[PDB]
Amino acid sequence: IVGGYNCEENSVPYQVSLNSGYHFCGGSLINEQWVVSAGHCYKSRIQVRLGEHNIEVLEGNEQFINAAKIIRHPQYDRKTLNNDIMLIKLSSRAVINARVSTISLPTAPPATGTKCLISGWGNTASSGADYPDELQCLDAPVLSQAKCEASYPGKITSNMFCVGFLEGGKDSCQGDSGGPVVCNGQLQGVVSWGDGCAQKNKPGVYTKVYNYVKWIKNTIAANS
Amino acid sequence: IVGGYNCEENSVPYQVSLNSGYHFCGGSLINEQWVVSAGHCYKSRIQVRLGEHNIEVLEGNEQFINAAKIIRHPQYDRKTLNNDIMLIKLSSRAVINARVSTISLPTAPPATGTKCLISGWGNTASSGADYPDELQCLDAPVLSQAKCEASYPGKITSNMFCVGFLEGGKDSCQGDSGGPVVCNGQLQGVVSWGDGCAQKNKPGVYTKVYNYVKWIKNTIAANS
Known about the structure:
2 copies of one chain form a homodimer. By secondary structure, chain A is mainly β. Chain A has 2 domains: about 1-10 and about 105-210, Trypsin-like serine proteases (Thrombin, subunit H); about 15-100 and about 210-224, Trypsin-like serine proteases (Thrombin, subunit H), CATH 2.40.10. Chain A is built from 2 helices and 13 strands; from the N terminus they run E-E-E-E-E-E-E-E-E-H-E-E-E-E-H. Chain A has helices spanning about 145-150, 215-220; strands at about 5, 15-20, 20-30, 35, 45-50, 65-70, 85-90, 115-120, 135-140, 160-165, 180-185, 185-195, 205-210. In chain A, strand 2 and strand 3 form a beta hairpin. The radius of gyration of chain A is 16 Å and the shape is globular. The interface of A and B includes residues 127, 128 and 170 of A. The PDB classes it as hydrolase (serine proteinase). Keywords: human trypsin, DFP inhibited, hydrolase (serine proteinase). It forms a dimeric assembly. Chains A, B are trypsin.
């Protein structure tokens, strides 16, 4: 997150990190046993960690749980990042408390102008490496499909949307992929891709979770 | 400017010097008829010189134009140097050419990590006095507000930010005040103040021009 701020204490209890030794992506806890992330964060073996704030220093509420099942959306397109969404079944049930809890799926698609919270341990600098210890947060609004298509001519499908600022300055960045865009108590987006970070007229692009609401429930039901 | 270098030719066409008998400050040409500088560079009578490289020897492209109006920010705080910004209307419009051009105002605030270019004819000696003939340039990065607020605990307002190096060595200095800090082709900062030049962990503080974009255009429109 470029241009963000340190997430307050337990303001993001649904945030998880995917790890192969260390964190390579974020994710969102949507069921006591299921995490949604980006399909391009796919790996064969993933350890999910819950309850982290400072990703370097244990604060006591962390849960380390290895993925039991990693199911990337069947129609995921590597080149276009279309259907960039993936479900991870946890090998055991997360323990829900004030530090670890779930986020609701969306009942309606993202509404232009709506304020959302994006979070992650990604790079916080537009150029150069500058990775944060503490979970970063960013309030950004949903942009119109028009502004989104315009910014990325011929790249934007109906399974994507744009949240950010056309002036740049604030944005998601390398390391934030898979993480949550939560608007009005609902997971509307998964951090998907962008053209650089926080560049002018290059807002980040996010998977429209709303299009996958049935696929998620069906997939969870079939794998329970 | 300590630790810098002779700006190349034609690289800083927006740099101006303010003189009320002597070169006391720098400034930026932001309109054919307007200069931004530091409010603490206020004099009742100012002659602006544009197009200077060697501040001692005329090279042919200089324009000498007296200030018609000198408008300091109406909440400028002499004590805190909060709102350290000032607008000067030239008595005639500058001839815009290859060596005297304007610089764009910022469309988004300083994103930390971004390389900037500070410039001026200020003291190049941390200890003592060594004023250069040729304009000095310095590439310096936007420091996180966290790091800025630290170095000057309780001094740093939302109208200020820090550019430079915590190690020391490279920094603006006396006589640089008012001068430009340009990042991505936009005037992000105005040399304002610091504690010591090139001073270890006491980096340069700059007026965040972004917060003044509306005030500036309104003042210019109101005085044209």
